[PDB]
Amino acid sequence: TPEARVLVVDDEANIVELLSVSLKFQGFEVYTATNGAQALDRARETRPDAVILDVMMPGMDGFGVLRRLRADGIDAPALFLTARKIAGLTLGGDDYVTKPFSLEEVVARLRVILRRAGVRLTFADIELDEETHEVWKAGQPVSLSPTEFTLLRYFVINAGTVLSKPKILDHVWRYDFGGDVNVVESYVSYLRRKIDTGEKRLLHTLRGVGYVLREPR
Amino acid sequence: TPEARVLVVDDEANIVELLSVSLKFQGFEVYTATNGAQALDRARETRPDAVILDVMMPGMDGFGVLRRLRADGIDAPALFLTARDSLQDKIAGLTLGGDDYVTKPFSLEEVVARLRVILRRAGVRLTFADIELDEETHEVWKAGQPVSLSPTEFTLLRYFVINAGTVLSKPKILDHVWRYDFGGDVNVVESYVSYLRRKIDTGEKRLLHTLRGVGYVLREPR
DNA sequence: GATTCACAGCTGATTCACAGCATCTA
DNA sequence: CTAGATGCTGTGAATCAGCTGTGAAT
Ligand SMILES: [Ca+2]
Ligand SMILES: [Ca+2]
Ligand SMILES: [Ca+2]
């Protein structure tokens, strides 16, 4: 059975399939629309658990549509896709992500709005607060940058899975990022000197394959 | 069980929705209307505990709508949404009792607070650590001694106290504390947090924290 | 004066590229 | 054995996030 029913609405088909492929892979049941009519129809046809909405769409905007769905009885929270004005995106049970986004941030925020509508991350001695973005190593606090935290959360969620540098970059970095994978090497080096300082090495290198967060064998 | 039954009357659909969503999320049972006839119909069927009326409306203004409700024997207290430039004298004389007003554009935090007061007055001190606030008088105490706050500094502080221990991003604060039509920079929140820290965060133990790239949180250091 | 808030200087954090060194393996 | 491939990390530049002082306007 799926994690949730998600309606993805954006006038850009490339943003729509990028989200639908990632979320379909993460266990979600995904329906799409590239306009307000299609959106209203699909939402009435499938009654989703949450809606991902491009804020800037030709003709009918999401706000008009949300008002109609909620007046029917569909109280599904919205995760707005906004450009980098439009305000009110954090009212009720809704939240938003700015374009260009990363796959990790869209799923993370989507999961928050769903949990909020209807619990710290740990691996060995690493503790993550998804709310505050606070980190601890052996009960001691460690300060991490936004990128360092997203990367650690990716590894923790995917503990014991070998993750290649191109895969990490496609999930952790924004989809408009134009550089190579040495940025991943740099951020693994920072993570190591901040949260892999204990007797046992937890973040491992497998040459030409990837990185893996696992307890030493 | 709902906090109260509220009837929201305004001619603009998205003002009604802005109000509806916020009050529903706060634990209120919200009924709506876009005119005086629907308003009287909803009031007869739902029997609201408070009514929120837009003053400037076509056909029949908010004052007209209230007069019709009261003529029907619906004595629920009212909260008027007034225009800044007009009916100044009429609003002063019509709010001497149980009814109150907020000027449009309003802050969602101020509407809700003013609704809780008219509901309370019709049949009271917020606290966090050594900070005390009177929701009715707008007085603030920091470790038993008074502190003078502006209207914006007061709405900001109450938002933090009510939501103590919860991380609040600058856009979330702007959406709730600032006037809904605010088209400015998040720096305004940075400014008012600096105003608050200078007055209420003055001891060895920090209460109002910054989590870089996340937001602000009011909590004891632990 | 009180107030709101725009704006800009400042600071330290953050992102990221780049290169030279280390280690691995063909 | 060596030599290229692959990975690590110090240096530095550019940008950014958040804090605060000044001042315009009401
Ligand atoms: Ca668009
Ligand atoms: Ca990519
Ligand atoms: Ca009106």
Numbering used by the authors:
A (entry chain B): 18 to 101, 107 to 140, 149 to 247
B (entry chain A): 18 to 140, 149 to 247
Excerpt from the publication:
In M. tuberculosis, the response regulator PhoP of the two-component system PhoPR regulates the expression of more than 100 genes, including major secreted antigens such as Esat623. PhoP belongs to the OmpR/PhoB family of RRs, which is the largest family and contains thousands of proteins. These RRs have two distinct domains: an N-terminal receiver domain (RD) that contains the conserved aspartate residue as the phosphorylation site and a C-terminal effector domain, also known as DNA-binding domain (DBD), that has a winged helix-turn-helix fold.
The smallest repeating volume of the crystal (i.e., the asymmetric unit) contains two PhoP-DNA complexes. The dimer interface can be described as two separate patches as follows: a major patch involving both domains of molecule A, which cradle receiver domain B, and a minor patch involving the two DBDs only. The side chain of Leu113 at α4 (we will refer to this structural segment as α4 even though the helix is unwound) sticks into a shallow hydrophobic pocket of molecule A. A metal ion is bound near phosphorylation acceptor Asp71. This cation is modelled as Ca2+ because Ca2+ is present in the crystallization buffer. The switch residues Thr99 and Tyr118 have inactive conformations, their side chains facing away from the phosphorylation site.
